[PDB]
């Protein structure tokens, strides 16, 4: 139960998955010049 309120987020079952979290991450990091991203964190390739 590490993620508190994400348990209650609705989602369609069995078909047609949507990704709010990963889409938001990819959108927000797609704006910031990958070189300074590589400098920001070590996780990035």
């Amino acid at each position: 139960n590490g993620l508190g309120p994400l348990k209650y987020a609705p989602h369609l079952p069995f078909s047609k998955s949507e990704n709010p979290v990963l889409s938001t991450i990819a959108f927000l990091v797609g704006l910031v010049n990958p070189k300074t991203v590589q400098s920001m964190t070590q996780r990035a390739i």
Binding site: P5, Y8, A9, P10, P20
Partner: protein
């Protein structure tokens, strides 16, 4: 992410869990192969809920 439906789900889940625990207290009351401590705890949990 839809927050309105998330809060609706949270509240409905609270209600359903209350109802299942009341049913389980009634169950522990209605059979006589349980001890006295279990039966007393069930009765007073029923009163509280």
């Amino acid at each position: 992410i839809d927050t309105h439906t998330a809060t609706d789900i949270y509240q409905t889940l609270i209600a359903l869990n209350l109802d299942t625990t009341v049913n389980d207290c009634l169950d522990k009351l209605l059979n006589d192969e349980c001890t006295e401590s279990t039966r007393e705890n069930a009765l007073y949990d029923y009163y509280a809920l």
